Write a protein that binds this ligand. Structure first.
Ligand SMILES: C[S@@+](CC[C@H](N)C(=O)[O-])C[C@H]1O[C@@H](n2cnc3c(N)ncnc32)[C@H](O)[C@@H]1O
Ligand SMILES: [Ca+2]
Ligand SMILES: [Ca+2]
Lengths: 1016, 171
DNA sequence: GGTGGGTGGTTCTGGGTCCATGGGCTG
DNA sequence: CAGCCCATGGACCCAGAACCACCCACCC
DNA sequence: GGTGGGTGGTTCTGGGTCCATGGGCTG
DNA sequence: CAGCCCATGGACCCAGAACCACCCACCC
């Protein structure tokens, strides 16, 4: 770089000194050698005096042309004598026909770079830093072919659905030839013991369509036809493809797929750098699964890692190998394994990092890889083999890649990897290797999205037994999500590393702060000695200001889960947990540029000291007197009728009803609901009369939402019946009273609500609150109707009465509470109803919500003994009235203005009766006090203070608007048959509710503002 | 064919007679069909309104682009309104970066071909024989790729002795 | 600043030989 | 029959020879 | 001769869910 | 001991809007 430019200046002065000539013919050898040597490093070469026909038919000969391996010009250079005018000589040469695409008009003193026909940079050759910049730009100019290849790769992505239609039809026409069926049956049975115990003919047709698609592009775009001929696994799958893909069958498919392969082949043939062509391998990988098996992409995980993350993770594992094991990634003995290779990005970038001197040995016996899917396996093996060929000149086959389930091959006797025989040997050799670095991007997946997908994660007996005995056992959580595919890879890693080394992984950042990952946070500090976490935020499953703070996902904003690059080193005191978080409100670009421009040494980490609840972040303050009562406790609830462990204000607590089929069980009208339920009960009754085979394999048409409970009682051949006294009113979301079918048959978990509100319709008042760990701000709302689990985040309702089995409304406020209050305030006047309203008021107190915020977020809200009591229970009698009877409060005067439709076309009216329900805001994004209800009616005159009753991340008014918008049902059956909500029929009711809730909002904001500015 | 050019001359008359409009948008269908039908016989296809990023980062959308089977642009076309000076309007489009490799700028009465950034031929569209000649040139233009292919075929002949050395050693 | 060498590449263009080898003799 | 005579037309290639392109020297 | 408007394309940008499913209880 | 409660955090994607290019009506 700088060194070469310094040598250029040393030569120019010595040519005029030792030679005594300023003629261009002699002083040009200085720049010729500068360009020639810079080029040799960039994979190009400066050829001199190469003639070129110009447009007008004049052969022009520049002083030098930069040529690639495909003998194609990618830059030019013309030196002149300093006794002239560069600008004048540039103009004359340009007019002779000189190319302007990328040319350095050199003069012994200064040089200009005309890229794309326009001067881009003019520097002085007497500057070693300026000439280094000009030359970097000349030797990194993207030729037209590179841009036209990136256009073609993007278009191939959109045409992959259509290309896979031709190939699907082919694999279907092969199921008629008995030769194919015979071979397929042999493959399924050798892959049912090697890859997946449930390998099906459907899985085999996928591996065929992959072998065919990749065995055409590898020979056209990548020019490596030999790969398939010599690859161990490819020879096993060509034995299944040569039963049909040959002769006129192949000729027909080839002539119909050529329209989809033509453009990429044209552009790719003019590219010589494998680093540019590898973007096609990344696109085939991701888009194939998105177009063919979108479900298997979820199981396997099919997202590539941005190169910036992989290069940082490789550089940092090296700094940490030196600091702890006094070794280097290139040193012999450091065996690196990538458990989930994907496109092979980790091993390809290691090849680039390791020097050419050691690469050979590293490549033959130290870098190892594993993959479960064929298309990723083929793409990786080719990527790795071609990165070595470009760097080290010669081509050597990579013999360290195995097609095996990393978590199943835990034989450190199985037939895992027995797809072929060389594969099985590679698997057994890898198990014995002394691995020291386990680098990679583990697949992340906690659960399936809906029960109707039948795409549950596979079970791995050995690994899962290890997790239960380690991470889950140490956890005190009710729900364990430690069986995520990423925590399974984290267990395997801690076990594969048998002695000392690093496990550098990029994964979901729930481990740092999630209740389920309490046991991991306890066990990982025993297994490792130095843990270095680097939070890259990105959680898009959040909302409101949190969403804004999270920012963009370092994965090019393609995923919605939080991401952290962590390095867990075990050498051989206490575990040092170091932590650094990326700045808030950053975009994905800013986060990826930081990773590219930062070194591990420069990063300033913070020593996390785990608390006794094994929390690393979010540790609460202890200087508080937060030990002040307790609204509810798990012990008070599970108290065995002794009134001895009744140490909370309320005894029983319950979560709101979860149905697991909200679209089938809730409706704004009773008639619509009865009809929706009728279809369900009807279709279920047709399912319970099916062959046991279909019942056990869940082989039924999924037109109804079948959840765990239903599937269980449909295999038990139980029969459901419509009980019509189950349609009860229920607060679904704040200020949204829908109707629900309260049946234990169609509701998954009713929790302890059949005791709070018996049979759905019962007399009780519940102070609903947010549960822990909350992400949305603390929210508390009293209801007299059955709540939902999502009225507030993880809604935990605290009732005033409690109905025993066929019994009375036993007061739920405990006597310990009553006695304690009647003691501190010393007035036996205090009754349970006063305490109910006292608790509500304290929970609405702004300063309590601010001071004990981190406490409220991780525990049940403990209640202070505020001085007055009378004033507090009064404030809370007003608050609860407004909230419960929001359907009866005085309507605030709101000015309704109405506009006529644009024209008189029947469609204008229809399009203008569609709901918009949007808060008209100003340029400062602050409400202007108007709401565009629909294209015609617009209500106005809302006070600014009414926008401050924020129940969650949304204000009370914004909640009413949102839950009355015409949103398409996610379920298909309901979208097609039971979608009959038109805002037109509910417009007048909404005009009334918005007005009533405006009063609730302004009244609440006032009462909350009258409350003191300090918390006991 | 001259028959194709003669049908364009009739189609144009009918568009201004049955339609009553001489707006470029309405009258361009006559030449669009001429170019499209000629191309269908020459192994190319006129794809209409395809955007191309010009050298100045700006995007230009010619009225039509002749495309090959490898989706590679082999020619271009931009129709104008007869109520303008074609010569003047050619300069405006060319200054916004409209391609000048093989482009037919055409008002309803006069057609100009600018092959290799230089006006090869300017004809009157009332003459069938003249338009057929100008169109032939446009449809038979040799793109840089075919000339580079020819150049490399000529290098392969002189580099054959050296390839055969490697293959002889192998055998 | 043209202007003619100096040097190297890049198109045309003009212009033209001894001697294999069957068949027929032939003695 | 082998051992003399007698034909009779032949699937290119390459040295000058411009003539350019570029540019140092040489006048101008 | 711009200018706004009609029409279609091409980037950005912002912003957020019900519900699976293991474990502990429990009578 | 098999039902019966109890959590708890989740490997994207798609409508508004901006703005841009082009041509037609519309002033000017
Ligand atoms: C999302 S990719 C990882 C990305 C890859 N490291 C990269 O940087 O490109 C996960 C891959 O792991 C592979 N894989 C290998 N063994 C696996 C296993 N036991 N379970 C799940 N996926 C596995 C899958 O085939 C899938 O392609
Ligand atoms: Ca020069
Ligand atoms: Ca046009």
């Amino acid at each position: 770089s700088l060194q070469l430019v310094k040598k250029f200046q040393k030569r120019l002065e010595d040519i005029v000194a030792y030679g005594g000539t300023r003629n261009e013919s002699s002083v040009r050898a200085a720049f010729q050698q500068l360009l020639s040597d810079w080029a040799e490093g960039s994979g190009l070469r400066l050829i001199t005096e190469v003639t070129q026909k110009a447009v007008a038919g004049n052969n022009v000969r520049p002083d030098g042309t930069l040529k690639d391996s495909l003998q194609q010009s990618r830059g030019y250079w013309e030196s002149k004598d300093e006794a002239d005018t560069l600008d004048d000589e540039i103009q004359k040469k340009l007019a002779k026909g000189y190319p302007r695409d990328n040319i350095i008009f050199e003069d012994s003193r200064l040089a200009v770079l005309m890229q794309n026909g326009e001067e881009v940079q003019r520097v002085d050759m007497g500057d070693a830093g300026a000439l280094a910049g000009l030359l970097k730009l000349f030797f990194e100019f993207e030729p037209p072919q590179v841009l036209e290849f990136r256009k073609a790769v993007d278009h191939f992505k959109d045409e992959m659905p259509h290309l896979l239609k031709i190939l699907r039809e082919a694999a279907d026409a092969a199921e008629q030839k008995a030769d194919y069926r015979g071979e397929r049956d042999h493959f399924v049975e050798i892959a049912k013991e090697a890859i997946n115990p449930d390998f099906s003919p459907r899985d085999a047709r996928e591996m065929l369509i992959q072998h065919i698609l990749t065995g055409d592009l590898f020979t056209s775009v990548f020019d490596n036809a030999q790969y398939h001929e010599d690859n161990n696994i490819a020879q096993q799958l060509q034995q299944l493809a040569a039963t049909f893909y040959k002769g006129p069958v192949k000729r027909d498919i080839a002539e119909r797929t050529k329209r989809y392969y033509g453009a990429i082949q044209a552009a790719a043939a003019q590219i010589a750098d494998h680093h540019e062509k590898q973007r096609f391998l990344k696109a085939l990988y991701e888009n194939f699964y998105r177009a063919y098996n979108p479900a298997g992409a979820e199981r396997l995980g099919i997202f590539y890692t941005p190169g910036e993350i992989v290069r940082f993770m490789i550089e940092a594992t090296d700094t940490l190998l030196e600091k702890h094991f006094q070794k280097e990634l290139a040193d012999k003995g450091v065996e690196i394994l990538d458990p989930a290779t994907g496109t092979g990005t980790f091993i390809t970038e290691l090849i680039d990092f390791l020097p050419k001197a050691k690469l050979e040995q590293k490549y033959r016996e130290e870098l190892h890889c594993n993959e479960l899917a064929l298309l990723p396996y083929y793409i990786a093996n080719l990527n790795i083999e071609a990165t070595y060929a470009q760097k080290m000149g010669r081509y050597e086959e990579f013999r360290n890649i195995v097609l095996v389930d990393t978590l199943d091959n835990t034989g450190f006797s199985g037939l895992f990897g027995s797809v072929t025989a060389e594969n099985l040997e590679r698997a057994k050799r890898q198990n014995a290797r002394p691995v020291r670095v386990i680098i990679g991007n583990p697949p992340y997946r906690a659960n399936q999205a809906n029960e109707n997908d039948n795409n549950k994660n596979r079970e791995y007996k050995e690994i899962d037994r290890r997790i239960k005995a380690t991470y889950v056992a140490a956890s005190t959580a009710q729900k364990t999500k430690l069986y995520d595919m990423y925590s399974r890879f984290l267990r395997w890693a801690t076990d594969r590393l048998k002695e000392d080394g690093i496990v550098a992984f990029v994964s979901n950042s729930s481990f740092i702060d999630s209740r389920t990952f309490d046991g991991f946070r306890k066990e990982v500090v025993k297994d490792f000695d130095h843990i270095y976490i680097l939070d890259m935020k990105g959680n898009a499953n959040t909302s409101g200001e949190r969403r804004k703070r999270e920012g963009g996902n370092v994965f090019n904003d393609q995923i919605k889960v939080g991401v952290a690059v962590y390095f867990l080193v075990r050498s051989a005191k206490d575990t040092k947990i170091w932590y650094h978080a990326v700045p808030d409100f950053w975009r994905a670009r800013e986060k990826l540029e930081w990773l590219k421009t930062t070194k591990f040494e420069d990063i300033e980490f913070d020593h996390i000291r785990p608390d006794a609840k094994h929390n690393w972040l979010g540790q609460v303050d202890e200087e508080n007197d937060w030990n002040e009562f307790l609204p509810v406790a798990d012990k008070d609830t599970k108290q065995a009728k002794g009134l001895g462990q009744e140490r909370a204000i309320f005894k029983l607590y319950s979560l709101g009803v979860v149905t697991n089929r909200d679209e089938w069980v809730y409706s704004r009208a009773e008639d619509e609901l009865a009809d929706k339920v009728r279809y369900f009960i009807g279709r279920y009754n047709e399912i319970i009369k099916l062959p046991l085979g279909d019942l056990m394999s869940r082989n039924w048409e999924g037109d109804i939402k079948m959840t765990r409970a239903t599937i269980a009682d449909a295999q038990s051949r139980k029969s459901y019946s419509l009980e019509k006294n189950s349609i009860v009113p229920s607060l679904y979301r704040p200020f949204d009273v829908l109707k629900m079918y309260f049946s234990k048959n169609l509701n998954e978990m009713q929790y302890q609500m059949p005791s709070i509100f018996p049979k759905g319709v019962g007399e009780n008042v519940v102070i609903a609150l947010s549960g822990s760990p909350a992400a949305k701000p603390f929210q508390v709302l009293a209801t007299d109707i059955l709540p939902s689990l999502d009225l507030l985040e993880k809604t935990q309702c605290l009732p005033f009465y409690r109905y025993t089995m066929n019994g009375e409304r036993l007061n739920n406020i405990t006597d310990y509470a009553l006695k304690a209050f009647q003691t501190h305030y010393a007035d036996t006047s205090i009754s349970r109803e006063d305490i109910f309203h006292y608790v509500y008021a304290v929970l609405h107190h702004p300063a309590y919500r601010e001071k004990y915020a981190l406490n409220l977020r991780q525990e049940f809200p403990r209640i202070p003994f505020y001085p007055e009591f009378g004033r507090w229970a009064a404030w809370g009698r007003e608050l609860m009235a407004l909230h419960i009877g929001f359907e009866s409060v005085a309507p605030y005067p709101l000015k309704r203005t109405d506009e006529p439709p644009k024209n008189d076309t029947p469609e204008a009216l229809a399009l203008a009766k569609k709901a918009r329900l949007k808060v008209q805001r100003d340029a400062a994004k602050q409400p202007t006090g108007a709401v565009e209800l629909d294209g015609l009616t617009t209500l106005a005159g809302i006070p600014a203070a009414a926008w401050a009753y924020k129940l969650g991340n949304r204000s009370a008014l914004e909640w009413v608007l949102e839950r009355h918008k015409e949103t398409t049902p996610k379920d298909a059956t309901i979208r097609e048959k039971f979608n009959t909500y038109r805002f037109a029929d509910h417009k007048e009711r909404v005009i009334d509710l918005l007005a009533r809730v405006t009063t609730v909002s302004v009244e609440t904001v006032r009462i909350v503002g009258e409350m003191p500015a300090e918390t006991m």
